[PDB]
Amino acid sequence: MVNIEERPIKAAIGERKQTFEDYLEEQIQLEEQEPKQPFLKRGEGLARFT
Amino acid sequence: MREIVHIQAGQCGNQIGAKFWEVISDEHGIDPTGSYHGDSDLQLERINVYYNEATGNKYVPRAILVDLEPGTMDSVRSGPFGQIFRPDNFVFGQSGAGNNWAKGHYTEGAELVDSVLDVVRKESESCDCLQGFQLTHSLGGGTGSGMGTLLISKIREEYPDRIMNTFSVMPSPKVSDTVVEPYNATLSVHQLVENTDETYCIDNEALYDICFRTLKLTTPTYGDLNHLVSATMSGVTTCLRFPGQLNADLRKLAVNMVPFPRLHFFMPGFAPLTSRGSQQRALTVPELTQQMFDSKNMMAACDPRHGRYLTVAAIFRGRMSMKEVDEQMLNVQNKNSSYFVEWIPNNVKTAVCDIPPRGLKMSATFIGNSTAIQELFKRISEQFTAMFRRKAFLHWYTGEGMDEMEFTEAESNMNDLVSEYQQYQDATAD
Amino acid sequence: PEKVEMYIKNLQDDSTLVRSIAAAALGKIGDERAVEPLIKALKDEDSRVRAQAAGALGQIGDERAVEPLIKALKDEDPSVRYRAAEALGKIGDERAVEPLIKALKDEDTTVRRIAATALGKIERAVEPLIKAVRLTAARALGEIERAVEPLIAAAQALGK
Amino acid sequence: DPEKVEMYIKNLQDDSTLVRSIAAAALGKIGDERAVEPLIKALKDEDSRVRAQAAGALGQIGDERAVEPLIKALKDEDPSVRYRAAEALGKIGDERAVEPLIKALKDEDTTVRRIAATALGKIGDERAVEPLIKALKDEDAAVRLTAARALGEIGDERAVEPLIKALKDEDAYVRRAAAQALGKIGGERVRAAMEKLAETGTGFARKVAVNYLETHK
Amino acid sequence: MRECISIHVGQAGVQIGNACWELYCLEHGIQPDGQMPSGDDSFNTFFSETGAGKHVPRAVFVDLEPTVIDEVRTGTYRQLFHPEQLITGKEDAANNYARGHYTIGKEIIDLVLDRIRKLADQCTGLQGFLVFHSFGGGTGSGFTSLLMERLSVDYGKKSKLEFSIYPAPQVSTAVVEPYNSILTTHTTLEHSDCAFMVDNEAIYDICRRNLDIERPTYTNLNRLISQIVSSITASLRFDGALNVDLTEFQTNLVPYPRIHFPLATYAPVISAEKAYHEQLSVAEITNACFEPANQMVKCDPRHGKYMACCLLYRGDVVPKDVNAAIATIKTKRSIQFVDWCPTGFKVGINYQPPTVVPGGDLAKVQRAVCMLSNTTAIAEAWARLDHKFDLMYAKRAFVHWYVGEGMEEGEFSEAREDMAALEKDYEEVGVD
Numbered sequence A: 001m002v003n004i005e006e007r008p009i010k011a012a013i014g015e016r017k018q019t020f021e022d023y024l025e026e027q028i029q030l031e032e033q034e035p036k037q038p039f040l041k042r043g044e045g046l047a048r049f050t
Numbered sequence B: 001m002r003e004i005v006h007i008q009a010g011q012c013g014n015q016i017g018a019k020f021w022e023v024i025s026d027e028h029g030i031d032p033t034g035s036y037h038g039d040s041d042l043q044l045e046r047i048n049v050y051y052n053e054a055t056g057n058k059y060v061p062r063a064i065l066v067d068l069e070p071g072t073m074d075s076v077r078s079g080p081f082g083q084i085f086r087p088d089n090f091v092f093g094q095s096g097a098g099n100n101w102a103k104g105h106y107t108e109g110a111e112l113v114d115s116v117l118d119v120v121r122k123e124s125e126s127c128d129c130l131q132g133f134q135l136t137h138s139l140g141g142g143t144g145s146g147m148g149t150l151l152i153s154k155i156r157e158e159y160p161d162r163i164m165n166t167f168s169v170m171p172s173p174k175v176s177d178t179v180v181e182p183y184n185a186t187l188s189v190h191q192l193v194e195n196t197d198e199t200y201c202i203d204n205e206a207l208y209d210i211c212f213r214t215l216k217l218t219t220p221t222y223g224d225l226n227h228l229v230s231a232t233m234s235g236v237t238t239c240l241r242f243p244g245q246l247n248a249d250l251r252k253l254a255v256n257m258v259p260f261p262r263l264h265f266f267m268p269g270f271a272p273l274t275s276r277g278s279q280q281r282a283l284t285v286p287e288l289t290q291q292m293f294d295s296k297n298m299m300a301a302c303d304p305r306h307g308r309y310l311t312v313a314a315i316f317r318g319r320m321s322m323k324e325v326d327e328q329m330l331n332v333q334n335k336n337s338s339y340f341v342e343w344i345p346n347n348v349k350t351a352v353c354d355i356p357p358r359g360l361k362m363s364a365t366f367i368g369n370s371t372a373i374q375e376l377f378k379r380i381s382e383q384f385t386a387m388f389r390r391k392a393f394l395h396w397y398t399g400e401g402m403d404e405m406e407f408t409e410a411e412s413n414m415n416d417l418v419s420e421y422q423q424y425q426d427a428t429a430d
Numbered sequence C: 001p002e003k004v005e006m007y008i009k010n011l012q013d014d015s016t017l018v019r020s021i022a023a024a025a026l027g028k029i030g031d032e033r034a035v036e037p038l039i040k041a042l043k044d045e046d047s048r049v050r051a052q053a054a055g056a057l058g059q060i061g062d063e064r065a066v067e068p069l070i071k072a073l074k075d076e077d078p079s080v081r082y083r084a085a086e087a088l089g090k091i092g093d094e095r096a097v098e099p100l101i102k103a104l105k106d107e108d109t110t111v112r113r114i115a116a117t118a119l120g121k122i123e124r125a126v127e128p129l130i131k132a133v134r135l136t137a138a139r140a141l142g143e144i145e146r147a148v149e150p151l152i153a154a155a156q157a158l159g160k
Numbered sequence D: 001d002p003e004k005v006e007m008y009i010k011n012l013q014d015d016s017t018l019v020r021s022i023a024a025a026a027l028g029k030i031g032d033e034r035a036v037e038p039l040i041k042a043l044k045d046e047d048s049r050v051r052a053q054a055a056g057a058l059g060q061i062g063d064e065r066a067v068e069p070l071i072k073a074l075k076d077e078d079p080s081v082r083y084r085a086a087e088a089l090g091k092i093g094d095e096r097a098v099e100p101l102i103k104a105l106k107d108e109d110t111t112v113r114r115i116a117a118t119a120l121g122k123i124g125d126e127r128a129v130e131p132l133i134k135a136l137k138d139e140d141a142a143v144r145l146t147a148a149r150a151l152g153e154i155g156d157e158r159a160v161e162p163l164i165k166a167l168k169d170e171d172a173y174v175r176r177a178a179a180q181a182l183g184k185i186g187g188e189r190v191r192a193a194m195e196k197l198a199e200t201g202t203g204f205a206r207k208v209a210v211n212y213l214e215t216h217k
Numbered sequence E: 001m002r003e004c005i006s007i008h009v010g011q012a013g014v015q016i017g018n019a020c021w022e023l024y025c026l027e028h029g030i031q032p033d034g035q036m037p038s039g040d041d042s043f044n045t046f047f048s049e050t051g052a053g054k055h056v057p058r059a060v061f062v063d064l065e066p067t068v069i070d071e072v073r074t075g076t077y078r079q080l081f082h083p084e085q086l087i088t089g090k091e092d093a094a095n096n097y098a099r100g101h102y103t104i105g106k107e108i109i110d111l112v113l114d115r116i117r118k119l120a121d122q123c124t125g126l127q128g129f130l131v132f133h134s135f136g137g138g139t140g141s142g143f144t145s146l147l148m149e150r151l152s153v154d155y156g157k158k159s160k161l162e163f164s165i166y167p168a169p170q171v172s173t174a175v176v177e178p179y180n181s182i183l184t185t186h187t188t189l190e191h192s193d194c195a196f197m198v199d200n201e202a203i204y205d206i207c208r209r210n211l212d213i214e215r216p217t218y219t220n221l222n223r224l225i226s227q228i229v230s231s232i233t234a235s236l237r238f239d240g241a242l243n244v245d246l247t248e249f250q251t252n253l254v255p256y257p258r259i260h261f262p263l264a265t266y267a268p269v270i271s272a273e274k275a276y277h278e279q280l281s282v283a284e285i286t287n288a289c290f291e292p293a294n295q296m297v298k299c300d301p302r303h304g305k306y307m308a309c310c311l312l313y314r315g316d317v318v319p320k321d322v323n324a325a326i327a328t329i330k331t332k333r334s335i336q337f338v339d340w341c342p343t344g345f346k347v348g349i350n351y352q353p354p355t356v357v358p359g360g361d362l363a364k365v366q367r368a369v370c371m372l373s374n375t376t377a378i379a380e381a382w383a384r385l386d387h388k389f390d391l392m393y394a395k396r397a398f399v400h401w402y403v404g405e406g407m408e409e410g411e412f413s414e415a416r417e418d419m420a421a422l423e424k425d426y427e428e429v430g431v432d
């Protein structure tokens, strides 16, 4: 059991492992191995200042 | 303008929200049982903003604790100040959001949303004068991001004339290894652009760099990042919690800080930067001013010299010379006038609170509306296009009934936002 | 493993909030070790703890909770009755069909709608379902030839 | 200069109220007679600031043509117009204004009552003596001051006994105006009254009487 | 007697009202409970009298939030004003003129007017209203415009004079104060007869220079403002043969529409800390009126033109001394009157010298003067505000806040165009 202030950070950036699409391409491949909803529009919030 | 309703969603929102309540409870003299045991009537003058008065001279956070995951509720309740929260204000489900924005916004989060709104309504109708809402959440996961923005959206319909304020934690590959975090962040930024009045950009990249580079913590923890967050939240809310003339309410702060409705994303900063277990040797007023305006002291990973300030809010805490504070605030604007917009006269406002934060005799907190915040959105946008151009992991969102055209609206809105910040960065008053 | 047994001890905590968080956490985990402690939590003094325990039993889906959940359908609190009806439909045991048919005559508008979508998830329920909460009965009939003439908000669920 | 007077005369019909009131003021400063009829038409203007400037200009010019229009301006709803008309009537000095100015001594506005008393003293008409003696009993000390001064200016002996009573006023400036006015009237009526005051009276009234008899023998 | 009703709007108007009524009570021998422990009852124009000797201010205090007026309700003068005279809302105007005038103000306007009606019906012959407010605040700018518009309809024939707080960034709490200043100036312009602006920077400088107060508080500022306000209203509250009544004062000082913003200059401002003060003569205080350090608004009258000039003296002031001091001032090349105007100084004398507030910053003086100049130099103050309005309005910065609260951009354009006409008005009269 560990205290909440000592909850460790799990970085994606490997160090001498990944940085660019080295982490992304490794994940896209591991994924391949396994009534549309109405959405908010641009400028919809602006309109509420009239 | 009295009461603020605080909502905390997801793991990050509840972890930074719990830290906020520990810090301000200490400042206001409230102990972990809810009892007041302070020594100054200034601690109680504006206690009503964040706390409800209960029987037994108890003060209860007007906080609503939300998560689809019950384990976060267990964590908060067990924490140092876990007992100050109202038990009926812990709204949780028996599922998660699986670090997927669509699960929190459309499916799982939507099933729990009306239970949260019942609690929000109970707190709201019980206010003599509701200022508005304050939400703590991360933009990288499912609950704080998806359900937090759904809560923002539903609250705005019901309370359209109340300020919507957020503390939004930006994702960073330096801190988390979830590939889809740029998706959840872009989808949330689109929501924030339209539905919030003021959003503080708490960037995990900046928090990781402050811990590693300046504070010299070679292996930083979430507690280390949250120490900078709680210090920021304490400083940026000082004006709302203590007596004063300037930015003393959410509306007055927004009317001073937000010139254009979409440009409400603030870059917070503070001085001195401290670590969890080190006792600070007080800073002079020139030291306080120099450092709070320094890039190394900002909570969003943006170089303020790569932009211009539209508006600035500066808060000085502790017993210090006000003559020195006005000398230093005038000097910082004169020496670096090219970094402040000329077409917004007197855009830098300074406040002074006599009560300094815990452990310090003197401190300063900065809130800037800088056009350099486009560096943060550009960074998220680059990570988003890398995945979206390949349609990577899209089936996770699309499978929850989400329209693929929403990714396009969100990407277009965040790229429009970047472009608007650049338009005002180039704007001249000729 | 350690978290499952920590939440099982928490079902006996003095705090009602701690008990209802524990019942919810055990449902999320879905571990079978919590089936008996959660069946004991269905007889808890507080209705928010009984409702979380009922919801957790549907999440786990163990048939040992069918009889206790059928008894939870006759609970004074409507949230417990709705959470038990939803769990019975999730488990899908045939023993819950007659009790869920009686729940279709419930005084509460929420407890009567919850029993309709549960009956659809689980033949005996066709005549009682034929007799806002009507949209759940219309959907259940489609999920289950007798419900063609009874069709002739309650419009979008006609074609099945 | 002649084309300047005619420019301000056209400006009395300008759409701008500011332009009209500046024109009426400028025409009064010039004092040219060509402006007397346009200024009499400006006394019926919709705006009170234009009517007041026109009334003030008519007193500055002093043409008797404005006496009847200024007498009608004394019954104006606006106190600035009544004040400016009362002052102009006193400046012109026509006897026709005496009865209207006597009614203005009962005005609800102190500025009007003071200015109507001063105007009546400038005209120096007998009819104003009994109403000005009543103004010596006014609640405002500035109106009592102008009534005492006007009575002295008129010089009618009916004001001797009332002015002697004003020597006991609460206001030091009213008492001095009354003593000055008594000296202005003069004669055996004031001398016999000062002879009484020199042995019966007390304070400033006794002082005034003793000083009057020192130089009046 | 002709009564005056004082209306105090927003935090600045309210807090100035506190300093004014604290001073009026001291000047008339009235205690904070309305009792006069102490013939010359001219203060009945500002105070009504109920029961056995309770003197109540003829004043309304209005604010769209309760914080400032709640201090009046619980402080020293809690038994001075009738509780119904202190009117508060809940949500303030958020430094937004449109919330003060439109969305928030519309909810309290009728209650305010009913309370003013109660005060008006106690007056046997109401002379006018004195309205105290800031230009910068949303209530001080927006609610005052709304109220002035309604007062023109309901009263009309009554005078309306303002004491307005012109903004200074040294104490300014809002970036949008230039907008609120132009918006309220435009909509009030036709509804006011006179407005005495007080530039917070000018008062701040007088406190630092003359009173040696490094960082003047609102208490310091407002106590000095009330001495100026007191000098202007003394003729209405005291009896005297040598003063100037409101009609004569107004017709000579502000005879023209629109251009009704006199520059007030006050002397002497002496520090209570000064070990020995040699009293200043009528000549000394008159000369000080033409010293720019003593001005209530920062501007240059020496490079402008005068339309009217009024000197309001109070204290041990003899008329021969004022005439002698004015003979000196007539021989000054820096005092140029406009051609079409009468070259002259109107003079008023009140017998009571300034009253000392116990605990205040001012020393006891035997005589004081408030000069009021209708000078074209006041246009410099409008130019500074209009330039700031232009920098932001060119980008429509913060305008969405106003449009979202019942206002249209067209109103900002009308206000700015009316201000441009006002700057042109002073330029045209001040022509050489």
Ligand SMILES: Nc1nc2c(ncn2[C@@H]2O[C@H](COP(=O)(O)OP(=O)(O)OP(=O)(O)O)[C@@H](O)[C@H]2O)c(=O)[nH]1
Pocket (backbone or CB within 6 Å): E009, E010, E011, E012, E013, E015, E016, E063, E064, E092, E093, E094, E095, E096, E100, E133, E134, E135, E136, E137, E138, E139, E140, E141, E165, E166, E167, E168, E171, E172, E173, E177, E200, E218, E221, E222
């Ligand atoms: N001299 C003086 N200026 C003041 C005082 N209080 C505020 N101000 C100034 O007034 C302006 C701000 O307006 P306020 O009066 O505070 O606001 P308000 O009328 O209450 O408006 P809202 O709060 O927006 O509803 C700024 O220029 C302040 O410097 C005061 O007591 N005295």
Ligand SMILES: Nc1nc2c(ncn2[C@@H]2O[C@H](COP(=O)(O)OP(=O)(O)O)[C@@H](O)[C@H]2O)c(=O)[nH]1
Pocket (backbone or CB within 6 Å): B009, B010, B011, B012, B013, B015, B016, B097, B098, B099, B100, B138, B139, B140, B141, B142, B143, B144, B145, B169, B170, B171, B172, B175, B176, B181, B204, B207, B222, B225, B226, B229
């Ligand atoms: N600063 C900070 N970031 C956190 C914390 N917990 C999680 N995060 C960040 O939150 C993002 C998404 O995680 P999370 O809040 O756990 O998801 P949720 O439970 O679905 O809302 C990632 O970028 C994490 O690094 C925390 O306590 N502090």
Ligand SMILES: [Mg+2]
Pocket (backbone or CB within 6 Å): E010, E011, E065, E092, E137, E139
């Ligand atoms: Mg205010």
